[model samples]
Target: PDDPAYHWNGAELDLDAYLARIGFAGERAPTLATLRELVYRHTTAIPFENLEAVLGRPVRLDLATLQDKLVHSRRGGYCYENAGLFAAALERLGFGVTGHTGRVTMGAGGLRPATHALLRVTTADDDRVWMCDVGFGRGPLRPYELRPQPDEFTLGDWRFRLERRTGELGTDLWVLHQFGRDGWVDRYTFTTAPQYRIDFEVGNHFVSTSPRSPFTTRPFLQRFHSDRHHVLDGLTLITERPDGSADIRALTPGELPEVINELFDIELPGPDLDALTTGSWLER
Candidate 1:
């Protein structure tokens, strides 16, 4: 059982406070339906960002720092950071949650590499469980049940499959397979294990501070709508419309702030914007 009075650092974590952050209240006992809504709403609403790449502030993984930057400051974060914080919230809600790592498949040709953080939750019945992720930049919006073999679990325009893989550990490892025009493809893999907050802290710092990090050089922001998706990179803004067509536009430096606020609902103060525009994508 989770302690309702458990304090991460000095800030106490309460289920109501976590749910209220996402606009959910009342008696929602961490069900699949509740999980789905919570994941989608928070992902779209909060965003996943690395503005520190421009601001020169490093991302810290300590629970106190996470609470200050994300919960109190009202900002967004990348996979490891976001999922790490989210797992804590879920645990406080009495859900059986564990963290797993997977390679990113966004740009990997067919075979997705294992380099991301995700969550797996066991249902109350103890017989059924599912994969719940809100951190994968390009991932399903809802939970993918582990049962029901061979059938496709669809979310948005994508289909996902959980397959068993054999390896070092005799137990079955689950891989996320996506359906494409060319057929099903490997996305990532996960095993049942508890991932500590410090684990993500290391990865988060690496991605945010490493000179070889893509986030440092690329100006990226993405948001998914019910009918479409919007992506931002550097000066270019690309919107995937409901019909699957895309519209792209480039913005001037002066116009960046307006675009970020209008499209992503993010408003940066003067100093933050200055840091974002003038900072190096990657610092050595």
Candidate 2:
């Protein structure tokens, strides 16, 4: 069954439909430049939200469900959900894309387990492919091509590298580094393997619905800009600039909606915000 080509709704996978959904109507088949533009545009325009938390809806992993919730419902999702959907769209666009699983050591303090879903795309040149992910909250804006040498690819002040890894499960790893006054530092690593959508469905449901899930208790939203990033958690808001400096602030209850819309481009309905504030709803 896995080998079979999965069928998708034209409305969901059609290039024009996808572009129009994200407020873009450029020319025909997207070029690498256009692909980058669409990726950033959609990611910045639509937010990865957990409305299912507040609505008590189950976050299913079926492609149909993802299509209905994300594309049709006009909402975004986390790494597994968003990356999975985006990979499907890219495949329909004639891009050789594959899903990947990785350990998101960002908040875990260190590499723990394979918990994040990402994408690896083999460009027309069979020899070169890149790690292309837009769902990771603080990920790079463009794709990172796999190179055999130690090199720095900078997007603003942050620099990222694709290095060869040494270990039992040997693989080329993509590491993100933040440029400081001193030098570059390690961030995260990802492998190049095709992952099944069901794998993410399991983790996605667990993280969104499990009692130990952080989203249930913490109220936060993150958005990445061209040169900076913003993360809002309840009353606290942190904005990091290109220079690595960040400004942290507290928001009034009345200001939460505006802040979410302004920074993440996500508009929470009035009643939904009230429910979230009251803690009466749980997202899945």
Candidate 3:
């Protein structure tokens, strides 16, 4: 338990700077309320993006690199980056956090790799472990209690639930569900087994480097609000509302940068912009 490899470098995290990055001015405590507020502010402020993967750049997982890119640079990142940062922050705030990996089942016909990262937190006042994930692109804005039985809760206009189910080979797993047009949809399923930082490093390497990775193939970005969800997938822009309404359209030439900058709050560097805009990636 004293091994440094087990934690996400929370003691070394610059808490002040991270608080500013997330625009969180609430009381910093290891309680459920603080966790909820922190999660809400963090998800709303920072976006979910895969710019580095799309550019064929190595995604670094060190604390310094995470702070530099996601915090200082105002750039958004995908699962590992987002969840890793949040885990560190929660640890610094005196919360008990354990890193977990999940297999994304959303929009999949079969089993997928366990590439998604998330956190299970123990609040000072709550005995139930809370599923704290600020990484999912369009997930709920607050944490949900990992209940043994299937129980549903609503946040903003979104409905979510956590259920314990039998996984492959009869292994017990926890599945996160989001209510959609087709009713309850499985976002991901994960075992509660504690994962180390090195475990995530291997997963990050494969996802960012593999040619078959969806993230490397296109620009996948998403941001969530109380009223609507924004998605920048490939060359398309999709807006989904709470009332089951959606607006999907293909981006025109030279409009990719504008959508990324304005909606996603990511300012692509000149070279990155040139590489992205000049390539046929914008035509899809």
Candidate 4:
């Protein structure tokens, strides 16, 4: 039986549809190998975006809503929508999963809120816990081994490290760092405390509604491939290559929808597309 505290609704998840959406036809057993394959396929298949939030709509974390948008209608979403659905899928497949939040510190100076969602997965064969974050859009393509000490590893084009740090309250927390040209940069910080659906709902409320949240302010979309990474930030389309080179292009409102479709594999509804292209936020 699944734990009710998680509120993953594993039994109700459309397992077959979710698997099909990610194009996974390989093994189903809960093991490290299966976890790697699942993460890779899922990260490449479903992009990460905040289009709904940008449109001033609520980002619901319920399983049904997630399935409708991410699997059926084929739309991308922010962390809660993507990771929330991913936790349910992992649970349905018999992997032990825990929900956690992270504070994005990429460009921020001080501490940021823990608005990002990720998962800690335990395979059936081993006691090792893996940090799985498919919702980061351009995050690591494979799972990272969560350890007590700082550990660094390379995945695809980027190298990442998971380290234990002392929080402001003196409690121990985990920080994820990425190697950049300057040095090691903190990506996000999180604790192992198990989070529930309600916890994410509150954070999602702030992220999708509050004026302070960036998701509610502009168009933020990202899709990462093995060869290249695509980022549609507001009116700019930035395509990043593996060699740290990037091409930037500015797009008119009329060109937004096609770029979204071609680059991110997201086909927005006509009305949503209209709203996105002509919405008040575009004035920025």
* Candidates' C-alpha lDDT: 0.65, 0.63, 0.83, 0.84
Q: Rank by TM-score, descending?
A: 3, 4, 2, 1
lDDT of 1 by residue, 226-276 (tens): 556667778888876434466789776677777777776566788877766
Q: Candidate 2 has which clashing residue pairs, if any?
A: 52-283, 53-282, 53-283
Better of 2 and 3 by TM-score: 3
Clashing pairs in 4: none
List the candidate 2 regions with Cα displacement exceeding 4 Å: 5-14, 23-31, 54-56, 63-74, 107-111, 169-174, 179-185, 280-284
| lDDT-best of 1 and 2 | 1
Ranking by lDDT: 4, 3, 1, 2
Model 4: runs farther than 4 Å from truth?
1-3, 148-152, 180-184
What TM-score does each of the candidates earn? Answer: 0.80, 0.81, 0.94, 0.93
Task: Give one digit per residue, the lDDT tens place, for model 3 in 121-195.
Answer: 899995888887788887678887777747777866787777888877887798877876456788888997788
In model 4, the Cα lDDT at residue 282 comes to: 79
| Local accuracy of candidate 2 as per-residue lDDT tens digits, 1-284 | 33434322223454555556766554444356555665666665556666665456676665677676666664666776677667766776666666677765543374555657777666553556666777876656767665553677675345765566754467556555545323456556666665666667676777778776665455667777777778876678888766767788977666776777777776567677776666532221
Residue-level error in angstroms, candidate 2, position 105? 1.2
List pairs with backbone clashes in candidate 1: 102-114, 102-115, 103-113, 103-114, 103-115, 216-281
Lowest-scoring 10 consecutive residues by lDDT in candidate 3?
275-284
Better of 3 and 4 by TM-score: 3
